[PDB]
Design a protein around this ligand. Structure first.
Ligand SMILES: [Mg+2]
Ligand SMILES: [Mg+2]
Lengths: 537, 531
């Protein structure tokens, strides 16, 4: 592995040793695709990078030599269609192996990758075209995505948006990605001089929900991949040798936390299972068969896995498992440990960061607690007056950046200096997450500082749902809030004032839920609706 | 002139006929630099495009051939420094003839021109760099502009921002624009295929004040220059081989309303007078000597002109826009010249939308009647249309499609775009009423935007500046009516524990705002309150 090249020291004897002695060593110029993937391709060509498979018996085994080859071809494909340094390209690719081709190709070119969920609806896509200034969309042919894109394109008018799809029939106005990719030269001339990437250049962007209005663009620089050394080597405890499996769709930040940067730096292969319908038994059988060694999933996924006879799939190779995204009930921890002999080690962070608080391998877990701060991240808890919190009091998790931006922290909200300044000022970046610290130094997440809702892993801005709801005739006014939930953390509640023409009923609730699911990504639908004569203001 | 190429017909007998029958014919693919400037450059090389001069003795006469030549050289200069299609480039060039080179060069590349005032301070420039994703700034060497840009760059970090200046000594990390332009090849090949421009491509962006927060990017597509056919031929009444003079700095939208697009389409040359301090006698003498035939200025300029004893024999037509017009200014100008000031109106987002056209008798103080193709309506709080005498918001009905000249969106701000343009109407935010004769009377903003001597100011631009001072705990910025200035900026301020109200403090707070943001925004009234 390349790990030792980027760190002060690889292994430590305790959390305290790790805190005192760990430093990421950032090279004068770092580009992940060139300095990790292409290095392996030359020095260890046959080293495994990725095991990919289907629910259709399709299997693709990628070495780093393979990934250099297809990412060079991908870079040329992008150049062919006028994509260059700084251009925003959206990727809606689920877990097609093409996602990895495109990411690496865009990194090589110095273009900007914008992964997005396949669940996006027309108005979501319009918003992202406009906010990012997208020059291209690369998407699956399935799930009516190209149709949603075309609808969005029509909304924007006859702009020169490039549209490439993976799979499917020939579509008028659409590029066939795989065909053109195969036709592309495997010789990509690395950009040099001023057109070459620098550490500070943006390479990756995620749209992330805010407390008011629509999702903001979290922009990450070329050193971001290095921050995931902490995520992969120290939190996930991956091994060169190994096969790491994080359950995450490419549309979400967790995909690159678990299926890309830090894993590959640490020399660990990644397992990708591109299924359409989650089946716990399918996931278990495939993961066991391919010999997955380390695992990450949200508590929801572990809930289904533990309802299966885990012992029947003698998951013999599983050596370490981590968890993040939803509240960890100790019962999930215990049942998993009783089946496997493995303790679920919880970690924490944000689209804007890498893992910032985690239960590291030298720590005994406190089931429910996110653990202790990651080295290099000066985590503090700040109250409403800008003062710091002592042990036992709730405050906002903030990151002290007075000595410089930690590796892995975002640069800004893209094209939004106002929101950036509001959230990051006077030497602290504000996560918007609330926690308290116990006497042992363990942190306990308590919720949001704002109106953002977290529902079984999904971060939801209330206005995303409110704006959808107000478009329905029956809605005069509405308020979207989260209500506590033991399993899902929170669920989305709509408090609605109906128009004169309508009366409250379960049927109408169904209709309004259905309306939301057709307007915006369906995970945002209000699970609880209450009809009221008036709202508080 | 190329006017007839772009319209259904040119001649009309009344406002009614014009409003009913005028239509712009938009080509399949239009790029102003190629389809207007380069056309004249080939078919009529010696045709006059621009007379440029100085307060310091300098004169430059530009034909269209000259302009093709230098804009081709400018395009290559931009390419050399990595500027291509869709790249935002800020131009802070006062009235240097270099503005024209750069604008046209950027159009040829399909890059995006962002003109800006020389008055921007560091924080203003940082904001624009970050909002636009600026890849280059081309600016004057004077007026401490390169210093403000350097401060801004330092604030942004090690970003790859190209910095080019016009004039001045060598600066570390700065490009010498004029030297490098002269070294650039005059051979430029029009980009084709994936690299070529389309009607829907953005070519021009202005930062424009909003009611809340910092200025928004008004983005205009490649067809926008055609909308100024209305502004130049019909409102300004320019003629083929005339000489049109609009008094406007290149940082502001009015410059392209008066010194570029519509004028050249109509075959009329533009007069550019790059002075540093305004002197009415100097302006009159230059305009007269060079033979200006048509004129536009804001009311403030007209007021200074009339305080002079007015031989301007070539002047045939004069228009006014940008500030409320007092009938006394109209009367005094008519008495001096025999020319009636014909008022027109619009926004950064549009071309001329309401005007006193040549067939109409002006009502001094009224902005006139709707431009053909702009379905101008007055709308109440209920989305209903207003009757005569009723104040409503000026809205533009776009249900039949976007009128030529209307902006595409607020760049990178779909939320603001949707808030202002939805359900078939673009909301201008300007309030007016219509009289019995159909003439429109402007009455103010629907929002908190302040307008002072023609300067649009978002209150938060001044509020954000003031709150940086230790003395200010809270503050509100509002407009108070002024007969000369339209409105003046007032700051109502709650002070901190350390400070005490005084005229010395007011002065320091005014000075502080002028150091932080463009100084035209300083609060002229300051009221200290307990709450
Ligand atoms: Mg480019
Ligand atoms: Mg760009």
């Amino acid at each position: 592995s390349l790990l030792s090249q980027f760190v002060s020291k690889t292994d430590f004897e305790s959390y305290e040793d790790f805190q005192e002695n760990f430093k990421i060593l950032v090279p004068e110029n770092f580009n992940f695709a060139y300095d990790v993937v292409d290095v392996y391709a030359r020095d260890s060509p046959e080293k495994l990078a990725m095991i990919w498979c289907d629910d259709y018996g399709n299997e693709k085994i990628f070495t780093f030599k393979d990934l250099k080859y297809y990412s060079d071809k991908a870079a040329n494909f992008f150049v062919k269609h006028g994509i260059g340094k700084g251009d925003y390209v959206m990727l809606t690719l689920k877990s097609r192996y093409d996602f990895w081709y495109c990411m690496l190709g865009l990194h090589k070119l110095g273009a900007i990758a914008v992964p997005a969920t396949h669940m996006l609806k027309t108005r979501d896509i319009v918003y992202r075209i406009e906010k990012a200034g997208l020059k291209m969309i690369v998407c699956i042919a399935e799930d009516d995505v190209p149709e949603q894109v075309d609808e969005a394109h029509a909304e924007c008018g006859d702009i020169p948006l490039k549209k490439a799809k993976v799979g499917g029939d020939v579509l008028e106005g659409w590029i066939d990605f795989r065909k053109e990719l195969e036709e592309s030269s495997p010789i990509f001339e690395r950009p040099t001089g001023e057109v070459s990437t620098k550490n500070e250049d943006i390479c990756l962007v995620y749209f992330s929900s805010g407390t008011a209005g629509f999702p903001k663009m979290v922009e990450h620089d070329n050193t971001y991949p290095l921050g995931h050394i902490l995520t992969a080597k120290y939190w996930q405890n991956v091994e060169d040798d190994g096969l790491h499996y994080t359950v995450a769709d490419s549309g979400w930040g967790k995909c690159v936390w678990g299926k890309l940067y830090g894993q590959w730096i640490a020399g660990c292969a990644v397992f990708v299972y591109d299924y359409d319908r989650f089946e716990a038994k399918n996931m278990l059988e495939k993961a066991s068969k391919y010999g997955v060694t380390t695992f990450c999933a949200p508590p929801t996924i572990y809930r289904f896995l533990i309802k299966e006879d885990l012992s029947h799939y003698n998951f013999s190779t599983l050596k370490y498992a981590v968890v993040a995204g939803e509240p960890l009930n100790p019962e999930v921890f215990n049942r998993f440990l009783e089946f496997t002999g493995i303790k679920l080690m919880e970690g924490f962070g944000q689209t804007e960061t890498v893992v910032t608080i985690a239960t590291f391998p030298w720590m005994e877990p406190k089931p429910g607690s996110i653990g202790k701060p990651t080295p290099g991240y000066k985590i503090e808890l700040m109250d409403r007056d800008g003062r710091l919190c002592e042990v036992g009091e709730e405050g906002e998790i903030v990151i002290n950046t007075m000595e410089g931006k930690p590796v892995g922290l975002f640069v800004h909200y893209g094209k939004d200096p106002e929101r950036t300044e509001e959230t990051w000022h006077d030497g602290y970046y504000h996560t918007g997450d609330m926690a308290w610290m116990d006497e042992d130094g363990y942190l306990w997440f308590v919720g949001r500082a704002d109106d953002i809702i977290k529902t079984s892993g999904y971060k939801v801005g209330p206005f995303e749902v409110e704006s959808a709801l107000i478009q329905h005739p029956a809605v005069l006014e509405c308020a979207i809030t989260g209500v506590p939930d033991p399993v899902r953390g929170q669920v989305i509640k709509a408090t609605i004032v109906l128009t004169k023409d309508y009366t409250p009923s379960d049927s109408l609730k169904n209709e309004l839920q259905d309306h939301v699911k057709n307007v915006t990504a369906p995970y945002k639908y209000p699970r609880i609706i209450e009809f009221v004569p008036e709202l508080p203001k």
